[PDB]
Design a protein around this nucleic acid. Structure first.
Ligand code: 19C
Ligand code: 19C
Ligand code: MG
Ligand code: MG
Ligand code: MG
Ligand code: MG
Ligand code: ZN
Ligand code: ZN
Lengths: 184, 368, 368, 184
DNA sequence: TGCGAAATTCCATGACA
DNA sequence: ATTGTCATGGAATTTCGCA
DNA sequence: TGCGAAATTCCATGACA
DNA sequence: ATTGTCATGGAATTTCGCA
């Protein structure tokens, strides 16, 4: 059987609702299975429509063979199905309540949730602006298991923005008290 | 003047006046019998004025000026005096065309890596499509991989909007652009410094300098056109298609598509190349690094038989950019401070500033 | 289709499928092991569709299309089928640029006599000077002698006004002009027939065809510009000066001024040539007839290494004149009815009319 | 002494007033001494101003060495003198009451007067339009004394409009009765 | 070890307003 | 302080299939 | 019958929007 | 049914003045 490549499989999922930021409420998360490269798109809802709008942007840069998701409404609609068939993208579902991805992906998705939380404190409303810097972070993060970052696996070169001081990613004492106080 | 000419009438030899012709007086003027006929030999103190009167009739160049003078006069080395005047005629110097071509173009080295250099530029205005009139075109120097963003103006504000979205993928070392208002604003300057991006600018009015993106603009317009044949020019919805189409199109000389040079593997697009199906991603990335370095690079073409190349301290003139009707096409002479390369120079200009300009926007001042 | 391919799997030889490779089945499709790798060999009944899908991705030419197909397929003489499609793609044919140059220019014989042929044309709009915006330029073909008339529009009415005044001097056999509105009006037609003048027209959008006057327009603008350096562009009062100036200026190659070729003697202008002071007018006119016939005439330049020349019944396409944004630069293919000369042709056009056009406004339809 | 050439001498004179035609009242007449070539310019008055305006047109085609005239006011003004000096045109006057030209010129001027009269009958008001055809006539008229027409002497070639039926130039019976009746 | 035909490469032309 | 580029389709050249 | 310098001719370049 | 042209100023070439 053939080795795993980029664009083999895109794992997609929504995160939200979050506090309004420049009109937006959710984040569509795309992660490449092989490389762990991450794309993020802000949406106003978790709908087939918002998913297609966003995926249209990405699929005009590269097209996955397979998209993997939970049985979210937006992904199970026949509109979404029609969309993917139109592009010879095979769709793939984890069974309800029991979500399976891959270790690499699971861990990536975990970093994504944590890193978001870390920045939407103090400025829970200003995340829209930060989505680009978040992505660069995530994508220039060293993978313990592989010798390489997702940027390096995707493009085959070092990045002009390496994230050398790999961070706490943990809530400092002040943030705990103003996150357990922001959700008051 | 009268000293020399007196000296002459009385048969004695003067340098410049060949001895075999005889030099008489008549009507109070020194004449001479030359093969063509009898010509007046004015005193030296008169010759400047004459050359000038003749030149001024129609502001003619060397031969056409000489021919008027030769109608009445003869003296030693007439063309020298004619050329002396041409070189001093402000009006001729800034209005005439050059008749010397630029030296052969440079073929700059291809950026080594994806994201080393971007070339960016606007296309438009286009027929309004969803209230959009322009397209931001961003082209990776090394790969040719191209991003498209529809805008309402070629503004800094829209450039920043689009480039924040692009640079979520990667941050480039350098962004080269023409001197369009959008890119030369200090807001854009801040935006770039904020991200450790270096701004590189073409010399002014020289789009060849952005040739990478310029050339890609052509492909973009060409493909949009075919796609819109016999439909209303609704191009907004096709940008994404055009992007994907071109990023996945082969350059016959390279034998690669910008997508391949960017990723080393085709994505799920029609006719995807399957040749590395058995390599591991690493063996794949290793072959990509090889492919990348060994790509065809063209060389400087032969200089045309009548090119000029700039030399430090030479008198040269910059082309007036948007010359008003009936006004000169050239600025006043200026001096070459520094030869940055054989096709680019720094000059001390028409007011008193330093300017970096393309050799294509200069002519060498004639007659020294 | 399946006939040929059945025939093949069972080891028997088919023309076009070289014998040394082996042709198996897998996943229900005929494949073959080629040096580059394993490729599907689609049935002939499938190949048109494939070539089309590949071509349509970015409407690519021969090699870039081939390279997509070769990713998955192999069959005999692929490029033939590729080219077959290119030649049938309406959108590619009318949008792509030519890559074949026009054949070398004709250098038509100089009119034999003053007044044999006029070339006329308008310059402008110019900065308003006394409410005038244009200049009628009339150039005698044989002599280059030039008349200037300031007008308020490039209209028939003004053309007739000026030409009545000019033709008080002489009536010309023929007046050549571009297809500007002023000259193609039926009023102008009447005006000319009324006087036994023959109207000659350039092919459309080809000002090289009026090169005689066009070129003189350059001199006129150039001289006006120098004369107006640092003054307000008040050109009305200078037309007369410019006229006289240029009519009395030497062509270095000819060694004559248009005034001399027109009259055989200089008038009382500065630097008048005095060489025929001793001849009678008749001896003078006799020398003029000699000078006139022996003037330098240039010859056709060498064809460029990749020119094309039109051939009766060939498929060629006329350039769209003022193409809208995002629309094709070329009209649909049409046929060469008649080869008037090697640079001029008659074609049966895009609707159903006869048109006389310059080879410069055509490309040969590619792929036959 | 040197043979006679074109542009050696221009003989100028006014003719008028004539009946108004498109605003004009007079004709300035220029005839080249050597060639007998004729130029005609319509003016609103016989003034230095109108003379300069008209001569400016002609002297932008060719410049005579000498202009010859009667001591008409317009030609004796110092404005006219200044004008000519500016162009190195020498001025030349016949003594008052005793006008001398040349035979060729005299006869030309005569033809001009007659031919005008012949056409400003029946249409005394429409001459402005006819000045061009008048000139072509005059200039393609055979000179008994020389083998050639003025067109031929000026340009050294035949003309595309030869005036083959050299005319009566005399008033036919009908015109006599309506010219001796128009001046009623 | 050499042929005829296909495949590939070369490259001038033109457009990025 | 910066610098032309590259799709295109005939022609020229090389390679291929067979001997 | 030959030299050094001037005079002439050649000609590629660019503009007629 | 029509068609490029020619001022320009360095360089290349020819001619000139003298021997
Ligand atoms: O694209 C632009 C452009 C222009 C002026 C000013 C700008 O800012 C531009 O972007 C003209 N232009 C088209 C052009 C014309 C001739 C060439 F050789 C190339 Cl490469 C490209
Ligand atoms: O003079 C005109 C003109 C044009 C369009 C339409 C007309 O009617 C014209 O008179 C363009 N043009 C200038 C021009 C451009 C390129 C050339 F090669 C030459 Cl020779 C002359
Ligand atoms: Mg631009
Ligand atoms: Mg541009
Ligand atoms: Mg015109
Ligand atoms: Mg024109
Ligand atoms: Zn000048
Ligand atoms: Zn096509």
């Amino acid at each position: 059987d053939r080795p795993q490549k980029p664009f083999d499989k895109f794992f997609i999922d929504y995160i939200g609702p979050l506090p309004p930021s420049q009109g937006y409420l959710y984040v569509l998360v795309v992660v490449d299975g092989m490389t762990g490269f991450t794309w993020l798109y802000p949406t106003k809802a978790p709908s087939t429509s918002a998913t297609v709008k966003s995926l249209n942007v990405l699929t005009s840069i590269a097209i996955p063979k397979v998209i993997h998701s939970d049985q979210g409404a937006a992904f199970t609609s026949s509109t979404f199905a029609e969309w993917a068939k139109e592009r010879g993208i095979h769709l793939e579902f984890s069974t309800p309540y029991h979500p399976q991805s891959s270790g690499k992906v699971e861990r990536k998705n975990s970093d994504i949730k944590r890193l978001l939380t870390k920045l939407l404190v103090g400025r829970p409303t200003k995340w829209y602006d930060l989505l680009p810097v978040v992505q660069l972070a995530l994508n220039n993060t060293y993978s313990p298991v592989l010798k390489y970052t997702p940027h390096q696996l995707l493009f085959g070169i070092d990045s002009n923005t390496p994230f050398a001081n790999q961070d706490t990613l943990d809530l400092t004492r002040e943030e705990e008290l103003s996150l357990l106080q922001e959700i008051r | 003047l009268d000293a020399e000419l007196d000296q002459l009438l009385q048969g004695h030899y003067i340098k410049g006046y060949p001895k075999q012709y005889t030099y008489f007086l008549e009507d109070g003027k020194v004449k001479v019998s030359r093969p063509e006929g009898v010509k007046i030999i004015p005193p030296q103190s008169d010759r400047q004025k004459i050359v000038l009167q003749a030149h001024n009739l129609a502001h003619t160049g060397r031969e056409a000026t000489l021919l008027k003078i030769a109608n009445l006069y003869w003296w030693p080395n007439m063309r020298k005096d004619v050329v002396k005047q041409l070189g001093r005629c402000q009006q001729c110097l800034i209005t005439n065309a050059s008749n010397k071509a630029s030296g052969p173009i440079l073929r700059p080295d291809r950026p080594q890596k994806p994201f080393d250099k971007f070339f960016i530029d606007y296309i438009g205005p286009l027929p309004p499509s969803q209230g959009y009139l322009y397209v931001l075109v961003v082209v990776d120097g090394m790969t040719g991989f191209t991003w498209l963003y529809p805008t309402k103006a070629p503004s800094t504000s829209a450039t920043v909007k689009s480039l924040n979205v692009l640079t979520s993928i990667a941050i480039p070392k350098v962004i080269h652009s023409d001197q369009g208002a959008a890119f030369t604003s200090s807001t854009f300057a801040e935006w770039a410094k904020e991200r450790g991006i270096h701004l590189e600018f073409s010399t002014p009015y020289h789009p060849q300098s952005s040739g990478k993106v310029e050339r890609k603009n052509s492909d973009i317009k060409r493909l949009l056109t075919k796609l819109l044949v016999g439909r209303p020019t609704k191009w907004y919805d096709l940008l994404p298609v055009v992007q994907l189409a071109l990023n996945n199109t082969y350059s016959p000389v390279l034998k690669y598509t910008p997508h391949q040079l960017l990723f080393g593997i085709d994505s799920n697009t029609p006719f995807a190349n399957q040749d590395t199906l058995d390599l591991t991603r690493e063996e794949e990335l290793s072959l990509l690094q090889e492919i990348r370095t060994s790509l065809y690079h063209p060389s400087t073409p032969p200089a045309s038989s009548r090119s000029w190349s700039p030399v430090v301290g030479q008198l040269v003139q910059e082309r007036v950019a948007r010359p008003a009707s009936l006004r000169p096409r050239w600025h006043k002479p200026s001096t070459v401070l520094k030869v940055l390369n054989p096709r680019t120079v720094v000059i001390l200009d028409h007011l008193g500033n330093n300017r970096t300009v393309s050799i294509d926007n200069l002519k060498p001042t004639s007659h020294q």
